């Protein structure tokens, strides 16, 4: 049989799925998907899905540490005739996938606004964690950006990070959004929709 083509791996919120395409044949082909993780005991590929006729396979159950690389291969079959394997490029969930946004809450005090940044739900001992949050603030018609370092700071824990912003210049509306930056490859999470608060002068 011909070889599967365009083998691709996509991940949103650490849920990797493998996809491929196949040409029309005079009969209905079936496929088998195999996964190999970096740090394997010997030199073995593990079966993810066996003999399916659709063109995708969720491999979430075969991810070790999100920072570690993995490879996938797919072959087609016709009764007794199997094709050659089509192979994926090296994939690491932390480097190649995308993570959803953090959730933000704002409240006001006398001369400052307090912002609570809750880590994206997927994160609540791997090197795949958020190292810094880039916080974008708009106050009336001005804009400023702040950075929170999650490790060198008492401000952050396993559930959230906190930030205090000073109120000034007769500004009455403060709008805030944030995105996280992952350790190791510096990949960014999605940016949160902006939340606003009104200060009465």
């Amino acid at each position: 049989v011909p070889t599967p083509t365009n083998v691709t791996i996509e991940s949103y919120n650490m849920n990797p799925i493998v996809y491929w395409e196949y040409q029309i044949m005079p009969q209905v082909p079936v496929f088998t998907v195999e996964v190999k993780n970096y740090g394997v005991k010997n030199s073995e590929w593990i079966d993810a899905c066996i003999n399916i006729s659709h063109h995708y396979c969720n491999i979430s159950d075969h991810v070790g540490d999100p920072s570690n690389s993995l490879w996938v291969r797919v072959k087609a079959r016709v009764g007794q005739k199997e094709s050659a394997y089509a192979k994926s490029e090296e994939f690491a969930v932390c480097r190649d996938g995308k993570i959803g946004p953090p959730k933000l809450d704002i409240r006001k005090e006398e001369k400052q606004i307090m912002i609570d940044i809750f880590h994206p739900s997927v994160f609540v001992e791997t090197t795949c964690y958020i190292r810094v949050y880039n916080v974008y603030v708009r106050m009336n018609g001005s804009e400023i950006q702040y950075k929170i370092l999650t490790q060198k700071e008492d401000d952050c824990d396993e559930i959230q990070c906190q930030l205090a912003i000073p109120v000034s210049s007769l500004n009455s509306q403060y709008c805030v959004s944030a995105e996280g930056v992952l350790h190791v490859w510096g990949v960014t999470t999605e940016k949160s929709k902006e939340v606003c608060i009104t200060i009465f002068n």
Partner: protein, 242 residues
Amino acid sequence: MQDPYVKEAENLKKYFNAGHSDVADNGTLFLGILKNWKEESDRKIMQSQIVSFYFKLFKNFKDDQSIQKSVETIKEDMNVKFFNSNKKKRDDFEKLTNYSVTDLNVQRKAIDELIQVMAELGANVSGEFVKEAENLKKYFNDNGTLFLGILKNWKEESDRKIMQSQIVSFYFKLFKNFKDDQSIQKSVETIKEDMNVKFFNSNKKKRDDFEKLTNYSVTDLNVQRKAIHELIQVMAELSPAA
């Protein structure tokens, strides 16, 4: 926002074909071992062997055409992360990694300083230990030391562990090469075990991780490919813990 050394390590991966699935075969060289150790002094003795292994590997390829810039960039980032850009710390470490355990004068100096070295490791040696060491000083028979002057240069504990890791591994190699030598075979065995007891603080797991690290040949192509595949993750954990 990505650290500049990352793109250069991805260039080395391409050069060595370390993005191929064959590289996965047979466990890990460095990553799993580093996972096991969380206190900073234990991390520094393991990291010290990992860094010298990468430095020996890069010396074999420093000039290769399309990767000369990449290697230069990565060595300089290791300098910043592991040596805190301290040129004297980096120089003392290189001196220690380059001593030949087969040069008879080097072996003499090393056997001469042994008692003082254990002192520097924080050990209170037994009367027994002292006699076995005089056997060796006899067998093997300058205004420069091998190890004592370097050890006097560093007082912070993490800097000390970086250097002590390279001294303990030199001795363990010297002992291996004389393990079954008639005259001094019982001396060698006696010293060898009190050094292990003290440095590894009676932790067999720590001892074993250390011998694993110490017995990889950076010469085999497959080991070299795995080392290059693990580089980016190893660099991400080289800085001081918190």
